[PDB]
């Protein structure tokens, strides 16, 4: 009203405070007869987050579907068979919501974030968008027109360019199918090519409806009539990839050689030995990266040097992996990486958006949310013996190398693979 | 006989598109029963319950404020100080930014290494941020390590060594960054905007400061700055997460025993050095830059001005957008719609900055050279429209969006701690969500028009532009577009 | 360092305008609109 | 309905007269809709597939050549003409429905006619 | 940009050509008040058209009624004296602002490349202005109207073969009479609309390159929009001209003319002092100095040949007189000579005025003879004056 | 030649007068040569290094700003001016020589002026 | 830019680069970023260093030797003597070139 902001406004009804100690709520999960998993968890935070996670990605493209998953991300929350794109945007804006979509190599996600009082609106708009996309041609061609520009604006970021680069160079099969498709599969992508990809891949047994901040009762009341009629289809085996090692080279000039050396680490399906990869990542634009999947992962280290100093940086990095594999790590350094690892997983976990992602992430990967507690145990149980042998076993396997920029002074794959 | 409708390729293709149009004329009403595109002003305070923000004032004037969440595993603890570059002088400009650097560079009890090995052993994080009017040092740590983080914060704010060899090294780092990392063109536009809008005031000075000051900063200067500004009545200790108020208060009264006791408020320094807005512009023309970037600002409202809430609602009405946003052609913001439909900007953003006695309300835009003329028209047209025609729907939707954004951004111990610290410095209290929501709901269409007529109509503006900006209209064109002569 | 480069890199709140034709009013004075 | 030929015999003759006139030039009734007449039309035309528009553009060029030459389509070509085979009306209705939805919600128009 | 929606109304097709050519046209920021007489000339043209149209609603083009109808305007028409004085003195105002317009161009070498067509269109405009003003001065049918027309329509007789034939076809008979006055009135109504069209071509031809500036340099780096900077700069000149015009209209309405035109035309008697309007005096003094009828007409033509040939002479590459001190002083001597020629024109034919007119006509033509050689000498200035 | 300053004192006065007028604006004499005056200056100006052309444009903008303001350069700035330091005459003479060679051998010009 | 329309020539260079390490791996068609440096001053410095009389042969098929020398000798004797240098050594290795 009229008073200054330092003075309380008279006549405001104040809700009673929440207790300083609030017992966390259990994750209720319900599986439908068609195999669709609905999982929710109640929180005292007024903000709600509802996501839909699909077991689908770039590994289901090859061949004659290259680029479908990146287009599908960009065609999210567009026109559906029941409401135009204009009305959809106006419905989300009217409740102060926000929508996001993400396409990885193995997972697709669709999330809406709004106040808890708008759960029926969020669920209805979310399910309609993923279940009944119209894929109108003028909307596809606009997203296709936008997709051209982002791919062009990708070699401005050598971190991302190289991380995509070493995935296709190191794996053979589906995991080598690029997430960013080249500008030749884009002149073939159409609305009807997207509808065939989605009708065959977006099945109820490959979906998870995960919500953070809702009651499981009414969330079932709204979601069941919109999802119960999905056909029950048998689960198909995931398309298998094989790590083989490889080399990426590309001379684009410049005076900043970018580099990535990478190795193979076990995937999420291997309990432990995937924790060690994150602790190893913390033990180490130059950094150490990690890209893990269900059954195989990739651990590597970046680097940025000069045109003529692009011979010793690689051996420099190749010396640090040898040192860790040789046992040249002190307990003070190991304990710092352990504490850094345990704190990071606990610090990202207070974000309501991430905790909802983690619910959908895990119920797709495993089928249940595994408590962070056993993860923390597997962290503090690590010894210098485990770190040294994990690296020794990791770096004795075939090597993956990536290089962008001036590559004239970078040596061969054999002249670098022999270092390990 | 004529060919059947599916024989010629163009006849078959027309049949395919026609059939697909037919399937859009019959929506399934299962999916059309809850969501509506008409914005409704809702009132749900039952979901607004939050843990109590307990505040305690010590006899020395220090304030400790906590919002406890004992189920959480992490906590954020830190110090917010009513001090910044505004309260410096023309000879001490840059001492606050220098002090931020040196704040983690040695103590009697701990050296530079010993401090950072300890932060790493607990897996914590130390962050320091300084602005024109606020300075903050806070720690992100686990529940079991709050007392250690408070011990560290008190140690670095009361016993810092400021060794002259460290100063000279840090002097070289600061001199380097002042002349080698200036490509952050967005913050450069706002830095020049503050300098021209608040010219000849303490608020027009940059946080980083001149090189002449930086290369003359000594041990004493950092010590005098702490003595005069880091006083107990000007600092707040805020903690959020797994923290107990009584435990934290007792740690504070044990550890903060060496603060300055100067009983000078920030209201007195501001009144002694008021900040005032001057209509002016600075144009940094460089055709070698691919993109133009400009910001256009009006003098806005201070923190405690009740019209500040209306300026937040008006800022949401203008909204923000960039090329990657998907539905920009359909949002409620008419400015975003004009930009998105006609492709006249790479990005556009409305900002509302507040200070103790003034503020800035305006729009920052990135565009190509050939889009500048049309873009400048749309920006000025949509801003000026707020004084003439405000629909009830557009103000109801901006109120709903603002209420949602202010509460969806409070996810994590960190955003809650900085909220507690910032609000205690600006309002003298943490405003309950129920009250802020009530002040937002008060901003109706008549309120927006009244506030817009006070701040926008036929008012002077400040312009800060860089890049290929020859096509940008001059000051008189922007000045004229603040009123409509057809009314 | 060139004059334009330094001016872009260092915002200057003590701007001195040309005063041969027009003298400014003191800063912090309400507008003559 | 008075406009329906199945019921009104005058509407039957109206359709027959119009159909005979279009057939002489090889034109469809939708070919008489011009993008310049209305912005809703040119928005609908842009949304149609390339093959539809190419055939329409070719039928328009063929008719203009006939009109210039003061001649009609040969009778063996007139027999295979489809004057009322539609390709534009369904799209035009959708485009107009979406414009009415924008207006009802106070949104800005997606496209505007220039002031001549 | 994609112009899906409507932006500023000025950019819409209904007003894009006015926006681009009048409102947003880039103009050198350093134009002086000397660059505001082009618009004044356009305003003077408009005033002459508007007052002339309403004066023609009361004037009779007959030798038995012309003089008395002008007296009926001054006396009986409500507001008639002002229409007549705004038109009679507006013609003098038209020539003052155009003479200053012309001399602005000579000082700053505005005729030079790339604006030779602009200067050539201006010279044609000057010829139309002289014809329009002269035949209008015959309309009142006073003593100077009749004897002024008798001379100029006789300028054709200098042609040997068909000279007499052109004079009588021009007259419509064997003497200046009603057929001459009736045809002068029709041409006096039509020529100002041609003058409007020529000024539109003149303005269009200039906008192909933009105006020259006092420094005479390339000005693309410091151009601004015509509205509102040179709109308010021109408006100051418009208001000052309105004050200047009002002083002539309301306080000295007849000092710019001669009393002899208030006597009705008498083909028998002849005024002892027959002179044109003051703005034709410099041409009239050039004609009088040559003691040969054919030579005098040749010299008058040579004036316009010299003016038309100025832009095409090979010259030095510097434009402004601010950096050409010899051409600067050469310009100030021409202006004193042009003022001298006008004064000599009003003087009768007798010593010493005959010799002074002959030297003054020589000095006028020497300007256009010495201008080209100065460029040929001046092209070597950069080589000679080295660092 | 009479236009030699070392030989003729009248040309010394002329050069001194020209240099003084140019110095008040910070202009070089070569800055008075306009690309729009002839297509040779434009060709010669296109062949000069960018930094030279960039400096010439800056002097022109500075001179235009002074002329609009009815100002001159400060005496300190005037003291460091070099009004007759050349950057264009040698290039222009080279362009004219190539143009004259093309004409003598019957070739077409490499450029021409648009008919106004 | 039109190199990618002749796959034999594109693949021939792309294996010269990938099959050698030293000087022979230097592209015969430099990348665009390597062109925004080349200028006349660079060309003169390169040409003056590498174009030496001991490194040039004037072969003329279809002329008498007397008249070839009579014209050519007074135009090339001016060139000074430069102690000959050795062509840099190049190393063949393996390698793969891939542009998806
Ligand atoms: C003492 O004595 C003297 C005076 O007395 C007091 C003076 O006052 C003056 C001053 C006078 C002047 C400077 C004016 C003289 C200059 C000119 C150009 C005269 C102005 C020109 C005329 C009067 C001639 C008018 C022209 C015509 C009638 C041309 C007619 C032709 C027309 C309209 C069209 C031609 C037709 C066709 C081609 C047929 C097809 C046409 C179609 C439209 C289809 C002098 C010198 C003088 O010594
Ligand atoms: C009715 C008569 C005339 C009208 C309405 C007129 C109008 C104009 C206008 C509006 C301009 C542009 C603005 C300005 O520079 O003032 C202009 C420029 C010019 N005019 Fe005129 N003019 C007339 C007569 C003449 C004459 C008689 C000449 C030459 C014999 C002439 C030569 C020029 C030149 C050279 C320019 C360009 C000046 C420059 O760029 O510096 N004009 N004229
Ligand atoms: C189409 C527009 C014009 C019309 C209809 C027109 C008409 C007339 C008429 C009817 C008269 C006689 C009334 C009188 O004695 O004042 C006249 C006189 C005159 N007009 Fe015009 N005129 C026009 C434009 C011009 C222009 C452009 C000029 C200047 C070049 C001009 C110069 C004169 C002069 C000098 C007189 C004689 C004034 C006098 O001595 O009384 N007129 N005109
Ligand atoms: C940057 O460039 C420009 C200038 O140079 C620096 C100018 O000086 C001016 C101002 C001067 C002008 C427009 C001179 C007037 C124009 C002409 C052609 C001279 C004579 C014009 C007459 C008599 C107008 C008669 C025409 C009419 C009435 C046409 C019908 C239209 C209507 C009734 C609305 C303008 C606008 C300009 O942009
Ligand atoms: Zn810093």
Q: What is the 3-state secondary structure (H, E, C) of chain A?
A: CCCCCCCCCCCCCCCCCECCCCCCCCCEEEECCCCCEEEEECCCCCEEEEEEEECCCHHHCCCCCCCHHHHHHHCCCCCECCCCHHHHHHHHHHCCCEEEEEECCCCEEEEEEEEHHHHHHHHHHHHHHHHCECCCHHHHHHHHHHHHHHHHCCCCCHHHHHHHHHHHHHEECHHHCCCCCCCCCCCCCCHHHHHHHHHHHCCHHHEEEEEECCCHHHHHHHHHHHHCCCCCCCCCCCCCCEECCEEECCECCCCCEEEEEEEEECCCCCCCCCHHHHHHHHHCCCCEEEEECCCCEEEEECCEECCCCCCHHHHHHHHHHHHHHHCCCCHHHHHHHHHHHHHHHHHHHHCHHHHHHHHHHHHHHCCCCCCHHHHHHHHHCCCHHHHHHHHHHHHCCCCEEEEEECCCCCCCCHHHHCCC
Residue E97, ligand 3, Cβ within 6 A: no
Among residues E277, E315, E337, E361, which one is catalytic?
E277
Interface test with A, best of G13, G27, G100 (most A CBs within 10 A): G100
Q: Which residues neighbour E130 within 8 Å (Cβ) at sequence distance 6 or greater?
A: E280, E283
- Angle of helix B433-441 relative to helix B392-408, nearest 10 degrees, comes to 160
CB contact under 8 A, B35 and A125: yes
Interface membership of A187 toward D (CB under 8 Å): no
CB contact under 8 A, A253 and G34: yes
Contacts of E13 in chain D (CB under 8 A): 114-116
In ligand 3, the atom with minimum distance to the C-alpha of E56 is 10
Among residues B163, B170, B247, B273, which one is catalytic?
B170
Chains that touch A (3 or more CB pairs under 8 A): B, D, G
B472-484 in b/e burial notation, b at 16+ Cβ within 10 A? Answer: bbeeebbbebbee
Chains F and C: 3 or more CB pairs within 8 Å of each other: yes
- Which residue in E293, E256, E261 sits closest to E274, CA to CA? E261
Distance CA B161, CA B177 (A): 24
Distance CA E92, CA E278 (A): 8
Which pair of structure tokens corresponds to residue E215?
């420094």
By C-alpha distance, the chain F residue nearest C19 is F69
Is residue B170 among the annotated active site residues?
yes
> What secondary structure letter does DSSP report for B100?
H
Distance CA B138, CA B88 (A): 22
- The annotation status of E58 as a binding-site residue, yes or no, is no
- Ligand 3 centre from E138 Cα, in Å? 9
Interface test with B, best of A5, A87, A136 (most B CBs within 10 A): A5
Distance CA F71, CA C22 (A): 13
CB contact under 8 A, D115 and E5: no
Contacts of E228 in chain B (CB under 8 A): 476
Among residues E211, E289, E320, E321, which one is catalytic?
E211
Interface membership of F8 toward E (CB under 8 Å): no
Which experimental technique did the depositors report for determining this structure? cryo-EM
E36 burial via Cβ count (<10 Å: 0-12, 13-18, 19+): buried
Which pair of structure tokens corresponds to residue A251?
């001379």
- The annotation status of E207 as a binding-site residue, yes or no, is yes
Is residue B100 among the annotated active site residues?
yes
Q: Which residues neighbour C13 within 8 Å (Cβ) at sequence distance 6 or greater?
A: B194, B195, B198, B199, B200, B201, B204, B205
Distance CA C8, CA B293 (A): 13
Ligand 2 surroundings by CB, under 6 angstroms: E 35, 37-39, 41-42, 45, 98, 101-102, 105, 108, 110-111, 115, 118-119, 122-123, 125-126, 199, 202-203, 206, 211-212
- Angle of helix E231-250 relative to helix E37-55, nearest 10 degrees, comes to 50
Residue E125, ligand 3, Cβ within 6 A: no
Residues forming a β-bridge with A242 = A172
By C-alpha distance, the chain B residue nearest A3 is B306
Contacts of E2 in chain D (CB under 8 A): none
Say how many Å lie between the first and final Cα of chain G, rounded.
Answer: 17
Q: Which residues neighbour B175 within 8 Å (Cβ) at sequence distance 6 or greater?
A: B211, B214, B215
- The resolution, in angstroms to one decimal, equals 2.8
- Residue G5 dihedral angles phi and psi, to the nearest 5°: -100, 0
Contacts of B439 in chain A (CB under 8 A): 1, 5, 9
> What secondary structure letter does DSSP report for B260?
B
Q: Which among B341, B378, B476 has CB closest to E228? A: B476
Q: Which residues neighbour B463 within 8 Å (Cβ) at sequence distance 6 or greater?
A: B193, B196, B280, B281, B282, B283, B294, B295, B296, B297, B475, B478
| Three-state secondary structure call for residue E167 | helix
- The annotation status of B101 as a binding-site residue, yes or no, is yes
Q: Which residues neighbour F72 within 8 Å (Cβ) at sequence distance 6 or greater?
A: F24, F25, F66, F78
Q: Which among D110, D115, D116 has CB closest to E4? A: D110
- Ligand 5 centre from B188 Cα, in Å? 15
Q: Which residues neighbour F60 within 8 Å (Cβ) at sequence distance 6 or greater?
A: E217, E218, E219, E221, E222, F27, F31
Domain region containing D88: 1-116
E160 burial via Cβ count (<10 Å: 0-12, 13-18, 19+): exposed
| Three-state secondary structure call for residue E120 | helix
Torsion of CA B51, B57, B63, B66, to 10 degrees: -20
CB contact under 8 A, A44 and B49: yes
Q: Which residues neighbour A171 within 8 Å (Cβ) at sequence distance 6 or greater?
A: A241, A242, A243, A244, A296
For atom 45 of ligand 1, which residue has the closest CA? E284
CB contact under 8 A, D114 and E9: no
Contacts of A137 in chain D (CB under 8 A): 47, 49
In ligand 4, the atom with minimum distance to the C-alpha of E211 is 6
Which pair of structure tokens corresponds to residue A298?
């990739």
In ligand 4, the atom with minimum distance to the C-alpha of E196 is 23
Ligand 1 surroundings by CB, under 6 angstroms: E 130-131, 134-135, 144, 148, 151-153, 170, 187, 274-276, 280, 283-284, 287
Token pair 């410091």 is at which residue?
E222
Contacts of B39 in chain A (CB under 8 A): 93-94
CA of A395, closest CA in chain B: separation in Å?
Answer: 27
Distance CA D53, CA D73 (A): 21
- Ligand 1 centre from E101 Cα, in Å? 24
Contacts of C14 in chain B (CB under 8 A): 199-200
For atom 24 of ligand 2, which residue has the closest CA? E122
Q: Which among C8, C14, C27 has CB closest to B284? A: C8
Chains G and F: 3 or more CB pairs within 8 Å of each other: no
Token pair 């970046």 is at which residue?
A302
Which pair of structure tokens corresponds to residue A67?
């680029």
H-type alpha helices, B73-218: 95-102, 112-121, 146-158, 164-180, 185-197, 211-214
In ligand 2, the atom with minimum distance to the C-alpha of E36 is 16
Which pair of structure tokens corresponds to residue A387?
């770190």
| Sign of the torsion formed by the C-alpha atoms of B307, B313, B316 and B317 | negative
- Ligand 4 centre from F70 Cα, in Å? 28
- Angle of helix B9-22 relative to helix D50-69, nearest 10 degrees, comes to 130
- Which residue in A45, D102, A264 sits closest to B240, CA to CA? A45
Interface membership of D115 toward E (CB under 8 Å): yes
Domain count, chain D: 1
Chain G, residues 24-53, CB within 8 A of chain A, namely 25-27, 31-34
> What secondary structure letter does DSSP report for B273?
S
Chains that touch D (3 or more CB pairs under 8 A): A, B, E
Among residues E58, E62, E72, E207, which one is catalytic?
E207
- Residue B283 dihedral angles phi and psi, to the nearest 5°: -115, 115
For atom 42 of ligand 2, which residue has the closest CA? E122
Contacts of A73 in chain B (CB under 8 A): none
Distance CA F44, CA F95 (A): 6
Q: In what helix (H) or strand (E) does residue B364 lie, and over which residues does it extend?
A: strand B359-367
- Which residue in E118, E7, E17 sits closest to B338, CA to CA? E7
């Amino acid at each position: 009203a009229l008073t200054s902001l330092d003075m309380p406004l008279q006549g405001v009804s104040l809700p009673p405070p929440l207790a300083d100690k609030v017992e966390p709520s259990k994750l209720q999960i319900t599986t439908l007869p068609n195999g669709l998993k609905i999982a929710s968890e109640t929180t005292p935070n007024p903000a709600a987050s509802i996501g839909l996670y699909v077991d689908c990605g770039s590994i289901y493209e090859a061949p004659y579907f290259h680029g479908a998953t990146h287009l599908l991300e960009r065609m999210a929350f567009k026109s559906t068979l029941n409401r135009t794109h204009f009305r959809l945007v106006r419905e989300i804006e009217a409740i102060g919501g926000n929508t996001s979509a993400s396409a990885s190599r193995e997972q697709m996600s669709y999330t809406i974030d709004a106040l808890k009082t708008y759960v029926p609106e969020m669920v209805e708009v979310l399910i309609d968008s993923v279940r009944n996309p119209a894929f109108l041609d003028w909307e596809v061609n606009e997203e296709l027109r936008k997709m051209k520009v982002e791919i062009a604006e990708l070699a401005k970021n050598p971190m991302g360019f190289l991380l995509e680069a070493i995935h296709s160079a190191g794996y053979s099969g589906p995991l080598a199918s690029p997430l960013y498709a080249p500008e030749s599969a884009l002149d073939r992508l159409n609305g009807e090519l997207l509808e065939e990809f989605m009708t065959e891949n977006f099945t109820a047994a490959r979906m998870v409806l995960a919500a953070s901040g809702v009651e499981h009762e009414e969330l079932l009341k709204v979601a069941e009539p919109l999802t119960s009629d999905l056909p029950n289809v048998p689960p198909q085996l995931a398309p298998k990839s094989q790590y083989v090692g490889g080399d990426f080279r590309q001379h684009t000039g410049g005076e900043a050689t970018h580099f990535a050396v990478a190795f193979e680490v076990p995937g999420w399906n291997n309990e432990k030995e995937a924790v060690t990869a994150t602790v190893l990542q913390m033990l180490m634009s130059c950094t150490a990266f990690t890209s893990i999947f269900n059954d195989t992962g990739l651990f590597g280290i970046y680097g940025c040097s000069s045109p003529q100093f692009a011979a010793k940086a690689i051996e420099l990095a190749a010396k640090e992996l040898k040192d860790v594999a040789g046992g040249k790590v002190n307990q003070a350094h190991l304990d710092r990486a352990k504490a850094a690892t345990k704190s990071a997983v606990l610090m990202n976990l207070e974000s309501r958006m991430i905790a909802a992602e983690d619910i959908g992430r895990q119920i797709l990967t495993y089928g249940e949310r595994k408590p962070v507690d056993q993860f923390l145990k597997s962290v503090d149980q690590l010894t210098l013996k485990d770190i040294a042998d994990f690296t020794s076993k990791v770096i004795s396997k075939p090597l993956t190398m990536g290089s962008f920029g001036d590559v004239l002074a970078v040596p061969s794959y054999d002249t670098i693979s022999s270092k390990f | 006989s004529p060919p059947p409708p599916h024989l010629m390729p163009y006849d078959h293709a027309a049949e395919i598109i026609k059939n697909k149009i037919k399937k859009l004329e019959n929506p399934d009403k299962r999916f059309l029963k809850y969501a509506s595109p008409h914005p409704i002003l809702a009132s749900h305070n039952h979901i607004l319950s939050a843990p109590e923000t307990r505040v305690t004032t010590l006899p020395n004037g220090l304030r400790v404020a906590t919002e406890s969440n004992l189920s959480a595993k992490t906590a954020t603890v830190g110090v917010w100080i009513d001090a910044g570059s505004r309260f410096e002088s023309d000879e001490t400009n840059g001492t606050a930014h220098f002090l931020e650097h040196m704040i983690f560079k040695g103590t009697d009890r701990r050296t530079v290494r010993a401090l950072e090995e300890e932060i790493e052993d607990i897996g914590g994080h130390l962050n320091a941020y300084t602005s024109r009017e606020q300075t903050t040092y806070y720690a992100k740590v686990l529940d079991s390590n709050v007392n250690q983080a408070l011990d560290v914060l008190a140690d670095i704010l009361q016993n810092s060594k400021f060794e002259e060899q460290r100063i000279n090294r840090e002097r070289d780092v600061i001199l380097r960054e002042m002349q080698e990392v200036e490509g952050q063109t967005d913050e450069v536009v706002l830095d020049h905007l503050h300098a021209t809008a608040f010219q000849y005031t303490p608020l027009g000075r940059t946080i980083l400061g001149p090189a002449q000051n930086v290369k003359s900063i000594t041990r004493e200067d950092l010590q005098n700055y702490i003595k005069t500004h880091y006083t107990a009545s000007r600092m707040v200790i805020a903690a959020a997460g797994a923290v107990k108020h009584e435990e934290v208060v007792e740690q504070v009264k044990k550890l903060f025993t060496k603060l300055s006791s100067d009983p000078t408020t920030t209201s007195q320094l501001v009144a002694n050095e008021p900040a005032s807005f001057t209509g002016s512009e600075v144009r940094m023309i460089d055709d070698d830059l691919p993109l133009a970037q400009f910001a256009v600002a009006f003098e806005g409202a201070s923190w405690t001005d009740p019209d500040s809430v209306a300026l937040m609602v008006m800022q949401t009405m203008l909204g923000s957008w960039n090329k990657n946003v998907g539905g920009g052609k359909h949002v409620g913001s008419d400015l975003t719609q004009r930009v998105a439909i006609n492709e006249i900007a790479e990005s556009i953003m409305a900002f509302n900055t507040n200070y103790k006695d003034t503020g800035l309300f305006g729009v920052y835009a990135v565009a190509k050279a050939d889009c500048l003329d049309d873009l400048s028209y749309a920006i000025m047209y949509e801003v000026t429209k707020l004084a003439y025609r405000v629909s009830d729907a557009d103000v109801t939707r901006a109120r709903n969006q603002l209420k949602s954004s202010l509460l969806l951004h409070m996810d994590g111990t960190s955003p809650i701690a900085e909220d507690i610290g910032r609000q205690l410095l600006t309002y003298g209290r943490r405003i309950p969500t129920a009250e802020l929501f009530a002040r937002i709901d008060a901003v109706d269409a008549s309120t927006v028009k009244r506030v817009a007529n006070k701040y926008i109509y036929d008012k002077d503006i400040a312009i800060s532009a860089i890049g290929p900006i020859q096509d940008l209209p001059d000051y008189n064109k922007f000045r004229r577009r603040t009123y409509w002569n057809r009314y | 360092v060139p004059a334009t480069v330094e001016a872009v890199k260092t915002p200057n709140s003590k701007i001195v305008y040309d005063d041969h034709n027009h003298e400014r009013y003191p800063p912090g004075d309400p507008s003559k609109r | 309905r008075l406009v329906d030929p199945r019921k009104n015999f005058l509407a039957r003759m109206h359709m027959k007269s119009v159909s005979n006139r279009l057939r002489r030039y090889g034109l469809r009734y939708d070919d008489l809709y011009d993008p310049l007449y209305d912005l809703d039309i040119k928005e609908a035309l842009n949304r149609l597939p390339r093959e539809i528009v190419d055939a329409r553009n070719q039928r328009l060029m063929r008719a203009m050549d006939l009109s210039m030459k003061h001649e009609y389509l040969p009778d063996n070509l007139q027999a295979v003409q489809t004057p009322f085979r539609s390709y534009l009306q369904d799209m035009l209705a959708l485009v107009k429905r979406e414009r009415a939805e924008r207006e009802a919600l106070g949104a800005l128009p997606l496209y505007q006619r220039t002031i001549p | 940009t994609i112009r899906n929606q409507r932006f500023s109304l000025l950019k819409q097709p209904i007003s894009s050509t006015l926006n681009q050519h009048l409102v947003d046209y880039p103009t050198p920021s350093n134009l002086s008040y000397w660059w505001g007489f082009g618009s004044l000339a356009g305003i003077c043209l408009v005033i002459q058209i508007v007052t002339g149209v309403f004066l023609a609603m009361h004037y009779t083009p007959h030798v038995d009624l012309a003089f008395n109808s002008v007296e009926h305007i001054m006396r009986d028409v409500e507001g008639g004296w002002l229409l007549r004085y705004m038109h009679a003195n507006g013609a003098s105002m038209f020539f003052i602002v155009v003479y200053l317009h012309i001399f602005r161009g000579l000082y700053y070498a505005s005729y030079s490349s790339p604006r030779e067509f602009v200067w050539c269109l201006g010279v044609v405009i000057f010829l139309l202005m002289i014809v329009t003003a002269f035949i209008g001065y015959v309309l009142p049918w006073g003593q100077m109207s009749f004897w002024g027309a008798t001379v100029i329509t006789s300028l054709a007789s200098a042609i040997p073969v068909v000279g007499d034939t052109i004079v009588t076809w021009l007259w419509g008979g064997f003497s200046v009479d009603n057929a001459t006055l009736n045809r002068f009135f029709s041409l006096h109504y039509l020529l100002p609309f041609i003058l409007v069209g020529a000024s539109l071509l003149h303005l269009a031809a200039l906008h192909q390159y933009g105006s020259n500036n006092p420094l005479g340099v390339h000005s693309e780096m410091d151009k601004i929009a015509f509205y509102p900077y040179f709109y308010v700069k021109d408006l100051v000149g418009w208001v000052a001209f309105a004050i200047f015009f009002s002083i002539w209209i309301f306080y000295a309405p007849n000092v710019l003319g001669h009393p002899d035109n208030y006597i009705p035309a008498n083909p028998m008697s002849t005024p002892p002092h027959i002179v044109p309007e003051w703005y034709f005096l410099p041409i009239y003094a050039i004609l009088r100095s040559i003691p040969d009828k054919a030579g005098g007409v040749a010299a008058i033509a040579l004036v316009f040949i010299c003016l038309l040939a100025l832009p095409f002479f090979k010259s030095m590459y510097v434009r402004s007189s601010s950096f050409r001190p010899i051409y600067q002083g050469m310009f100030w001597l021409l202006l004193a000579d042009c003022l001298l020629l006008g004064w000599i024109g009003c003087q009768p034919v007798e010593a010493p005025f005959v010799t002074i007119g002959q030297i003054s006509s020589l000095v006028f033509f020497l300007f256009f003879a010495i201008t080209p050689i100065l460029g040929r000498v001046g092209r070597g200035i950069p080589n000679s004056y080295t660092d």
